[PDB]
């Protein structure tokens, strides 16, 4: 009973919290489901299609709210598989997580909208904006880890100075070109009736949009727009290329490092050292295993404690160093160490067959 | 209490064979090398600086006491343990079979006897299944 | 007779299936031919040019159908050069390939369109859409390997998480900005008469299109569009840069690895081992060559079989490892092995001139 | 008194000149402040909002001018922390810096605009353009180092040939396509009434703008525009991708090199050598420290001077070489040196145990 | 006289043919001059400015034709500095170069246009197109090496498969999306009156242009355009990013390799060997230098010839290998060679102190 | 049948010189080293783990039998053979000259006598041309 | 003046033990090796070329005089000093504690006695605080 | 003519000390090693394959004759010479000073005496300036 119970618990936790293979399918389905809902809500906002789409929208709304509630309950139950959250207080702490609170606020907001806004199925006008915002936040919540946001932030920080330079130059050219076009076509063109119209046009231009609502018509304004467009469209599109290139480089490095064996071995060393530490506790009247083992390898008790903790902390440090493997630093450090070892060898042979030459 | 300080003083005296008052790299190598564990001098000397608060190249009694008070709870070893059992979890289930513990203990790191891994399975295998969870054991550290 | 026959067979198979140099020219010509056909069909759809282009279109259609049929026959004949497909059953298996079936469906569809739709060369209105779709599928088939699709899929999978992040952020900003612009200009602007018009405008904007059919006109809507355009045009253009950079990195690595000599030697080892395996079969009352060779190098027969299979399987593994050469992993593994060898050397010299010092 | 005085001096200099962490916040605030000013000035240029925004604009103008003046005074005071600028002449030299003069010209121009252009807070029409240009130059000055400009220039120079190729091809296709479209639609389309309209349209097109004011309408002009758009939009967008990729590669290399320990040690060697040089000056009747130290390590005085300067200059060179660490050159040089050392070792052992074999 | 004559010859050849520093300035000036000419010709095509710009255009035309002629003469004179082109036949061969013939055709075409098209200064209507084409070809000729074209072609070939994939996918989606939009909005929208209008709109869309002349208006056509725009704008912009990234990678590798010392030394070896080859010619009754040198290092004459040619050809090969330095291949080859040397060392020590152990 | 199992038992006995019942790395090195083939101990020991199903560092009788039953048809060696003859095909025609086989056999891998390559050309050169196709030979493997 | 030239001639004679008139790599190694400083011949020989104006592999009297006149003010050593104290400034404040000077002097580069760092702190620690500024010391160079 | 063939036969006999008819790596090493030039066997053996048309590991008389007929004009050495003098042209003027030729000849590659570089400057320095052009010398090769 308990074996299958815990098997199901861990399987559900893996599917919901850390999906790798088939679990994603389910997630995708939910996303599609949620996606469909907005689409139906989308199709319900139009009057000519509201009468034809509102029933399906309401049915899908009941389905999605039920699915979200059951998923939340299953997740807060499967949180018992990991020992961080077990028991009443453990499940409470799991619920304390920001995305869990986001989920419950989503559920209660959906309930409130369905109760008040839907005197029937179709929804109230005021509740419509709240419903759309709720769907937006559900889409935000679709990913629980926020790994996308973390990755984007890390990549941006890696290029913080440099994105900053791109943005600063882009803004400067936008302001300056807008100012001159406003000067040149203040009265001749009604499009640039005001400086603000010039700023809007310059933003539309430097972004490669080209709405056509505003555009220079004079020779001088057109010339200046041409020059500063050539100058600044590249700057405005630069952050996209910056990020794309940097993203590809990051994934390339991650692929390069993947091997991770020199990370494996120090893990074994460190875990053995940690078990020695726990087994050599002086205050514990147990753990005779490591005690007698050391007694084979030999004030005394405290000295053994001290040496064991020295080696455990240094092994922790060593595992920390192996925590980040880089091919370049790997080769550099390995070659430095090997060169030092080789130096020791040659000093040995020199002094040593010097002793021989003496004889 | 004064009892622990006296024990640390006795430990330092058993370490300060030369009586310098600051156990030096060669001396701390000698003290444990005689016992039966003979690590290469490189590991000892490069470890000394990691704990040498004053950076004198040795360990003085204050540096002895500060770490003697420092237990597993400090040094945020929790993350290191998490990574350590996550690397050896080829499935990611959060649990590892006991036989894999036997093998990894025997054939990696500072190798220990079947007795050490026996007490390991005693402590970790609380529910007696073999597929011991990492989170419970790491909680036992602070506990 | 047979020598020249097989020479022609292999030459045709190389030209059609695996073109490297001049063969591509022919392929290009066919492509151009096929291309011209649609263009002529294109030029035939316009009434003012249909009377002037339909005769050439029909002639080129006969030419291209004949060329495709003869090419299919020549290919299914030249499939005999490779031993996978030889004889009646071999050619049947070759025809089983998905692109071969695509070719025959193309041929039969072309025949059907030319027979029914062309009661007089010029084509029927209903058959016109089928003809255009047939041309589209022919263009799809132009490449038989599908190497382009495989490369695109591999690169996408390499950046799957990361393209996913880009798409997710782009979609989120699109939805959110469209929602606010719809709020700001629901009644003031007829362009954003509905939320759906706002979504269409937001997609046209974030993609740098700027049709001009819809655009904000209010100060608040224009401000919000400006901000979220700056935010999200980079995200929308990101996948292009991601893919381009990743593509360049992949080709760069492929160029880096090209040498392949450590891949050459294990191939020789493995093939020699495989021939030993075949020559040492116990059930075979032949192959006295390797039998007597081993008899020079020496229950007995089975032991020889066992050792030979050990070495053959390990050589297969070794060739497998050399199958993928990476400069970084090459240097890491080679230096680790050399360092271990060096350690062995120095242990030898130490213990050994210690023996000498003893004397 | 002096201790806290100098502590505050260095803290202010760090915050203003070289901000790393919290200091940036203050800078950002000032930027935002300055930014707000233009926005308010922006909002003040519109007549319908001028009466509502001019008071806040004037208040923020007083605030920003006061802030800039006090910041300039605090900076020219904190310049005493560094020994380059101390005392009357030191502060004068600090003021000589181009950005310091930019700051004072900004302050005086702001004073002049506020005195003359503002008869009563409201600003004069002529002084309005000067005020806007002053804000533009303040935004330019926001960064004192100009590190963004230096980085952009360095990256451009790194790709100078290659950006040049991109620009040259883009310009050529623009000219040529514009010429043909002008030929094809000289009279048929009023949009391309002149070649210059064709050039403007071609620039709008190759930049992916698509205003819609001008566009081909004839079959031939549309075909040519299609072909050369496909050809040249990629060329026009190329510089953006070039720069983005190159920027990412540069930051990647900078991250790769970061370790810098082989740069640390030669610094120690060089500084010790420099102190030896200063301590071994012959004309100085002091510095008996290094004099007696060398007297322990031994015409004589001049010889010691000479040897000390040899070693100091060579250590300076060595530190110069370590000034630029590159992983690739590090590995190449280190392996060459280690290989030469190994060669020396093996020659020693060969000749040496040859001597042994002789016995 | 001859010394200064040749100094000027080489200086002019360097400035015109291979400009590095200040020479570029002159080139730039000429380019600007030529550029100005078209601009003036540009400004001369407009009737309202023709009367004001034609005189300056004509003056600049005389100036530029004179400058081009004198530059051609100076270049064909300075071609004598290099020994490839010297004397009557050498200068003729230099003139045979394709860009030299381009220059003379440019000069003669300019003369013809100025003589016939310009009854005075004003230019003939028919000669105007020829003049503009001549300016276009002059701009083409501005660079004599064609290094930009060679670089672009090399980079394209490096990514030939991959650009091909991008183009193929882009074309496929363009065709397919255009087809469906034409189906959906054949009659509803006059913009897509024909399939060809749909193709033009699809090209304008997938390129991020957005003219606004044509665009979907129906729900289904708009949906399909949205989907395939998302799909294919990235593909259409892909070649730009591909090329930019690849360009940056190429320049990065070129910067990486720059050191070139292992290329320097084999050059010395090879040139010494070549001089030995020339000095050891048997048929030459001279060159007693190397003959007696070898006589110190010793049928005989032919044997010396043979050995010298062996070493010269192998040194040529060695210099060829050093011709292309790659950091990755450098490290791989150097480590393989060093490992083999180390193996030889250890075999020596093993067998050798085995001999010692025997004693 | 029991005949093959008996032959495998005889082979194991001829391998288990120590009689441990699990041929160990050093023992399997000794058994073939005495015959006349003397591979470095590294290759043997690193090969043992590749077939060691239980991971004991040796080969037990079940691990002997499982592979003894495992023939060329298993282990999907077909792809390896395809790559192996594709690398040595400088033309890509799918066929390789016999003389190139002589050379590559002689000067690479475990070198064999002209007799081995003679039987090789006998089997592969079915049509007697020298330019033997790869596909036919690899089909002969499974056949 | 002629006094400095005479002193340089005396120095060269004390260097040109062989009397060749161009102090050679081995000879300049010998001259200072006898004193008590014994740098590896590699450093000496690779340094000679850096100052060898004529590139003869040695140092002639003109190359001696040119540098003897060349003081700290030349060779733009200012930037090198700036980098040198900027690397050891973990804070970037522009000043470095005296104890860090003691440590870096003792454990890096050509190690010197406590007397050398004592005169160093004498000169640099003008205001007697320990946190000596880099800019003032580097100004002292030219001064 | 038959004279050159006879001379090549005499050369081969002076090379084929063993009389094998195909001068082998060790034999061609011995023949020139005795004269006074003693290149490492690696260079000889790795060079043999570069000229071994039949790939026998040696040089047969046909491979001797084919190259004996092959002069400087073949093997497109022109490009190699262009690169070789372009690398040593730090200015790119297309000419190199004679003293730089002295230095590079002396201190790189197979070093030769001042006599070799003397005949070099004789041939190259046709106009007697020292700054000898590369193009003229490389033309002299084919001439
Ligand atoms: N595919 C795509 C691309 N283009 C590519 O990724 C090219 C490569 C793909 C992979 C294989 C086929 C095409 C660029 C941007 C976005 N924006 C995100 C997005 C916005 C709106 C919606 C919605 F409105 F339709 F929901 C969905 C998603 C996007 F999706």
Reduced to 3 states (helix: H, G, I; strand: E, B; else coil), residue D346 is helix
User: What HEC string does F48-109 produce?
Assistant: HHHHCCCCCCEEEHHHHHHHHHCCCCCCCHHHHHHHHHHHCCCCCCCEECHHHHHHHHHHCC
CA E113 – CA E105 distance, rounded (Å): 12
Whether the CB of C235 sits within 6 Å of ligand 1: no
Contact E306 H11 (CB under 8 A): yes
Q: Are A7 and B94 in contact (CB under 8 A)?
A: no
Q: Are D83 and G136 in contact (CB under 8 A)?
A: yes
E174: how many CB neighbours lie within 10 A of its CB? 21
Distance from CA of D349 to the nearest CA of C (A): 12
**Atom 15 in ligand 1: which residue has the minimum CA distance?**
C236
Kindly give the distance from the C-alpha atom of residue C170 to the centroid of ligand 1, in angstroms, as a whole number. Answer: 8
- In E16-45, the residues whose Cβ lies within 8 Å of chain C are none
Residue E49 sits in the same domain as residue E138? yes
Residue H68 sits in the same domain as residue H88? no
Residue F68 sits in the same domain as residue F91? no
CA C139 – CA C158 distance, rounded (Å): 28
For chain H, what is the domain count?
Answer: 2
CA C359 – CA F3 distance, rounded (Å): 58
The verdict on whether residue H95 carries a ligand-binding annotation is yes
Residue E179 sits in the same domain as residue E126? no
**Atom 8 in ligand 1: which residue has the minimum CA distance?**
E231
**Atom 2 in ligand 1: which residue has the minimum CA distance?**
E230
Q: Can you tell me which atom of ligand 1 is nearest the CA of C207? A: 15
Contact C241 E242 (CB under 8 A): no
CA H29 – CA H12 distance, rounded (Å): 14
Kindly give the distance from the C-alpha atom of residue A135 to the centroid of ligand 1, in angstroms, as a whole number. Answer: 20
Residue F91 sits in the same domain as residue F121? yes
List chain E residues with CB under 8 Å of C168: none
Domain with E231, as residue range(s), is 157-257
Of F36, F75, F118, the CB nearest to C289: F118
In this complex, is the C-beta atom of C241 within 8 Å of any C-beta atom belonging to chain D?
yes
Cα distances (angstroms) measured from residue E80 to each of B79, C75, E76, H130:
75, 59, 8, 19
- To test the pocket of ligand 1, the residue of C239, C240, C243, C245 to mutate (highest count of ligand atoms within 8 Å of its CB) is C239
Which letter, b or e, does each residue of F56-88 get, where b requires 16 or more Cβ atoms within 10 Å of its Cβ?
A: eebbbbebbeebbeeebeeeebeebbebbbebb
Is D306 a domain residue? Answer: yes
CA E195 – CA E190 distance, rounded (Å): 11
Which of residues D121, D145, D169 is at a domain's end? D145
Distance from CA of C209 to the nearest CA of A (A): 5
Q: CA angle G79-G81-G82, nearest 5°? A: 60
The residue of F25, F30, F32, F85 whose CB has the most chain C CBs within 10 angstroms, and thus the best one to mutate to test that interface, is F32
Which of residues H58, H74, H90 is at a domain's end? H74
Cα distances (angstroms) measured from residue E148 to each of C115, E25, E137, E249:
53, 19, 16, 17
Q: Do chains A and F touch (3 or more CB pairs under 8 A)?
A: no
F132: how many CB neighbours lie within 10 A of its CB? 22
Which residue of chain C is at minimal alpha-carbon distance from D43?
Answer: C219
Q: Is D138 exposed, middle or buried (0-12, 13-18, 19+ CB in 10 A)?
A: buried
Kindly give the distance from the C-alpha atom of residue A32 to the centroid of ligand 1, in angstroms, as a whole number. Answer: 15
CA F2 – CA D169 distance, rounded (Å): 80
Cα torsion D168, D173, D175, D179 to 10°: value is 160
Element at E189 (helix H, strand E): none
CA D114 – CA D59 distance, rounded (Å): 11
Q: Do chains H and C touch (3 or more CB pairs under 8 A)?
A: no
Residue B59 sits in the same domain as residue B1? yes
CA C139 – CA C134 distance, rounded (Å): 9
Reduced to 3 states (helix: H, G, I; strand: E, B; else coil), residue G59 is strand
In this complex, is the C-beta atom of A249 within 8 Å of any C-beta atom belonging to chain E?
no
Residue C32 sits in the same domain as residue C139? yes
Kindly give the distance from the C-alpha atom of residue D17 to the centroid of ligand 1, in angstroms, as a whole number. Answer: 44
For chain A, what is the domain count?
Answer: 4
Which of B33, B16, B35 has the alpha carbon at shortest distance from B24?
B16
- To test the pocket of ligand 1, the residue of E177, E230, E237, E242 to mutate (highest count of ligand atoms within 8 Å of its CB) is E230
Which of E98, E201, E213 has the alpha carbon at shortest distance from E149?
E98
CA A338 – CA F142 distance, rounded (Å): 48
E22: how many CB neighbours lie within 10 A of its CB? 8
Residue C161 sits in the same domain as residue C200? yes
List Cβ neighbours of H40 (8 Å cut-off, separation of 6 or more). none
Which of residues D234, D257, D280 is at a domain's end? D257
Kindly state the DSSP code that residue F11 receives in the 8-state scheme. H
Residue D263 sits in the same domain as residue D279? yes
User: What HEC string does D245-288 produce?
Assistant: HHHHHHHHHHHHHCCCCCCHHHHHHHHHHHHHHHHCCCCCCCCH
A226: how many CB neighbours lie within 10 A of its CB? 16
Residue G43 sits in the same domain as residue G80? no
CATH of the domain at G68: 1.10.238.10
The verdict on whether residue E161 carries a ligand-binding annotation is yes
Whether the CB of E290 sits within 6 Å of ligand 1: no
Is C73 a domain residue? Answer: yes
Residue H82 sits in the same domain as residue H13? no
**C147-158 and C160-184 helices, crossing angle to 10°:** 80
Kindly give the distance from the C-alpha atom of residue E230 to the centroid of ligand 1, in angstroms, as a whole number. Answer: 5
Pairing of strands F95-96, F132-133: antiparallel
The residue of C271, C282, C295, C323 whose CB has the most chain F CBs within 10 angstroms, and thus the best one to mutate to test that interface, is C271
Residue F9 sits in the same domain as residue F41? yes
Q: Hey, what are B5's tokens?
A: 């300080």
List Cβ neighbours of C141 (8 Å cut-off, separation of 6 or more). C99, C102, C103, C106
CA A205 – CA A201 distance, rounded (Å): 6
Whether the CB of E234 sits within 6 Å of ligand 1: yes
Residue C181 sits in the same domain as residue C299? no
Which letter, b or e, does each residue of E90-100 get, where b requires 16 or more Cβ atoms within 10 Å of its Cβ?
A: eeeebbeeeeb
Which letter, b or e, does each residue of A33-62 get, where b requires 16 or more Cβ atoms within 10 Å of its Cβ?
A: ebebbbebbbbbbeeeeeeebbeebbebbe
The residue of G72, G110, G124, G136 whose CB has the most chain D CBs within 10 angstroms, and thus the best one to mutate to test that interface, is G110
Element at H128 (helix H, strand E): none
Q: Hey, what are D93's tokens?
A: 């030299």
Contact D244 A244 (CB under 8 A): yes
Q: Hey, what are A301's tokens?
A: 């008790």
In this complex, is the C-beta atom of A353 within 8 Å of any C-beta atom belonging to chain C?
yes
What technique was this entry resolved by?
A: cryo-EM
Kindly give the distance from the C-alpha atom of residue D236 to the centroid of ligand 1, in angstroms, as a whole number. Answer: 24
Residue C20 sits in the same domain as residue C92? yes
What length does chain H have? 143
Is A152 a domain residue? Answer: no
Reduced to 3 states (helix: H, G, I; strand: E, B; else coil), residue C269 is helix
Residue G68 sits in the same domain as residue G79? no
CA D271 – CA G86 distance, rounded (Å): 12
Residue B1 sits in the same domain as residue B70? yes
Q: CA angle E45-E51-E55, nearest 5°? A: 90
Long-range contacts (CB closer than 8 Å, 24 or more residues apart) made by A102-111: A102/A137, A102/A141, A103/A68, A103/A72, A103/A141, A104/A72, A106/A68, A106/A134, A106/A137, A106/A138, A106/A141, A107/A65, A107/A68, A107/A69, A107/A72, A109/A134, A110/A61, A110/A65, A110/A68, A110/A134, A111/A65
Residue G49 sits in the same domain as residue G10? yes
Which of residues H19, H44, H74 is at a domain's end? H74
Distance from CA of C321 to the nearest CA of D (A): 26
CA E244 – CA D165 distance, rounded (Å): 12
Half-sphere exposure of E190 (CA within 13 A, CB side): 1
Q: Are A9 and A75 in contact (CB under 8 A)?
A: no
List chain C residues with CB under 8 Å of E165: 147-148, 151-152
Which of residues G74, G93, G110 is at a domain's end? G74
Residue E110 sits in the same domain as residue E17? yes
* Phi and psi, residue E260, nearest 5°: 60, 65
In this complex, is the C-beta atom of E95 within 8 Å of any C-beta atom belonging to chain C?
no
Distance from CA of A2 to the nearest CA of C (A): 36
Residue A15 sits in the same domain as residue A110? yes
List chain D residues with CB under 8 Å of E204: 210
Instruction: Give the sign of the dihedral formed by CA E128, CA E133, CA E139, CA E143.
Output: negative
Which of E307, E242, E317 has the alpha carbon at shortest distance from E280?
E307
Which of residues C205, C228, C256 is at a domain's end? C256
The residue of A137, A154, A207, A215 whose CB has the most chain C CBs within 10 angstroms, and thus the best one to mutate to test that interface, is A207
D60: how many CB neighbours lie within 10 A of its CB? 19
Distance from CA of A260 to the nearest CA of D (A): 19
Whether the CB of C102 sits within 6 Å of ligand 1: no
- What is the resolution of the experimental data for this entry, in Å? 3.8
Is E148 a domain residue? Answer: no
Domain with H115, as residue range(s), is 75-141
Q: Which residues pair with A217 in a beta bridge?
A: none
Is D226 a domain residue? Answer: yes
Which residue of chain A is at minimal alpha-carbon distance from B115?
Answer: A289
CA H44 – CA D112 distance, rounded (Å): 86
CATH of the domain at A49: 1.20.120.350
* Phi and psi, residue H22, nearest 5°: -145, 100
Is E263 a domain residue? Answer: yes
Q: Can you tell me which atom of ligand 1 is nearest the CA of C169? A: 18
Residue A126 sits in the same domain as residue A169? no
In this complex, is the C-beta atom of D335 within 8 Å of any C-beta atom belonging to chain E?
yes
Half-sphere exposure of A201 (CA within 13 A, CB side): 30
Cα distances (angstroms) measured from residue A274 to each of A267, A319, A323:
10, 12, 17
Residue A115 sits in the same domain as residue A25? yes
Q: Is G21 exposed, middle or buried (0-12, 13-18, 19+ CB in 10 A)?
A: exposed
Residue B4 sits in the same domain as residue B65? yes
Residue G85 sits in the same domain as residue G20? no
Of C269, C299, C317, the CB nearest to F109: C269
Contact F109 C287 (CB under 8 A): no
Which letter, b or e, does each residue of D305-334 get, where b requires 16 or more Cβ atoms within 10 Å of its Cβ?
A: bbbbbbbbbbbbbbbeebeebebbebbbeb
Q: Which residues pair with H96 in a beta bridge?
A: H132
Whether the CB of C239 sits within 6 Å of ligand 1: yes
Q: Hey, what are A3's tokens?
A: 């074996």
CA C116 – CA C126 distance, rounded (Å): 10
Q: Hey, what are H130's tokens?
A: 């020292």
Residue E334 sits in the same domain as residue E238? no
Is D151 a domain residue? Answer: no
List chain C residues with CB under 8 Å of F74: none
Reduced to 3 states (helix: H, G, I; strand: E, B; else coil), residue F20 is coil
- To test the pocket of ligand 1, the residue of C150, C170, C206 to mutate (highest count of ligand atoms within 8 Å of its CB) is C170
Which residue of chain D is at minimal alpha-carbon distance from G34?
Answer: D298
Q: Are C233 and C208 in contact (CB under 8 A)?
A: yes
Contact C244 E241 (CB under 8 A): yes
């Amino acid at each position: 009973r308990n074996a299958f119970y815990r098997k199901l618990q861990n399987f559900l936790y893996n599917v919901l919290e850390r999906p790798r293979g088939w679990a994603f399918i389910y997630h995708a389905y939910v996303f599609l489901l949620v996606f469909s809902c907005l689409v139906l809500s989308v199709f319900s906002t139009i009057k000519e299609y509201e009468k034809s789409s509102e029933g399906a929208l309401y049915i899908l709304e009941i389905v999605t709210i039920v699915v979200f509630g059951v998923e939340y309950f299953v997740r807060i139950w499967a949180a018992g598989c990991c020992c961080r959250y077990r028991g009443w207080r453990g499940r409470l702490k799991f619920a304390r997580k920001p995305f869990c609170v986001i989920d419950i606020m989503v559920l209660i907001a959906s309930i409130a909208v369905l109760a008040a806004g839907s005197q029937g199925n179709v929804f109230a006008t005021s509740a419509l904006r709240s419903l759309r915002f709720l769907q937006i936040l559900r889409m935000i919540r679709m990913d629980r880890r926020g790994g996308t946001w973390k990755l984007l932030g890390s990549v941006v920080y890696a290029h913080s100075k440099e994105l900053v330079t791109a943005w600063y130059i882009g803004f400067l050219c936008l302001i300056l070109a807008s100012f001159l076009v406003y000067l040149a076509e203040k009265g001749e063109n009604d499009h640039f009736d005001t400086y603000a119209d010039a700023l809007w046009w310059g933003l539309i231009t430097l972004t490669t949009i080209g709405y056509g609502d505003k555009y220079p018509q004079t020779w001088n304004g057109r010339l200046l727009a041409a020059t500063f467009t050539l100058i600044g469209v590249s700057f405005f599109a630069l952050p996209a290329g910056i990020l794309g290139s940097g993203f590809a480089l990051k994934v390339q490095e991650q692929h390069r490092q993947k091997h991770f064996e020199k990370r494996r071995n120090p893990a074994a060393g460190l875990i053995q050292s940690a078990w020695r530490f726990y087994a050599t506790n002086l205050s514990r009247t147990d753990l005779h295993s490591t005690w007698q083992y050391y007694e084979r390898t030999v004030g005394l008790k405290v000295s053994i404690r001290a040496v064991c903790v020295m080696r455990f902390l240094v092994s922790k440090r060593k595992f920390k160093e192996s925590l980040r493997p880089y091919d370049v630093m790997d080769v550099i450090e390995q070659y430095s160490a090997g060169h030092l070892d080789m130096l020791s060898r040659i000093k040995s042979l020199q002094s040593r067959v010097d002793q021989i030459v003496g004889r | 209490t004064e009892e622990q300080i006296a024990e640390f003083k006795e430990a330092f005296s058993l370490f300060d064979k030369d009586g310098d008052g600051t156990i030096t790299t060669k001396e701390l190598g000698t003290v444990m090398r005689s016992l039966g564990q003979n690590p290469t001098e490189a590991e000892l000397q490069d470890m000394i600086n990691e704990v040498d608060a004053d950076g004198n190249g040795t360990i003085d009694f204050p540096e002895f006491l500060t770490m003697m008070a420092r237990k597993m709870k400090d040094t945020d070893s929790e993350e290191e343990i998490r990574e350590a059992f996550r690397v050896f979890d080829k499935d990611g289930n959060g649990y590892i079979s006991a036989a894999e513990l036997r093998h990894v203990m025997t054939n990696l790191g500072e190798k220990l006897t079947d007795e050490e891994v026996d007490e390991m399975i005693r402590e970790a295998d609380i529910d007696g299944d073999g597929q011991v969870n990492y989170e419970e054991f790491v909680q036992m550290m602070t506990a």
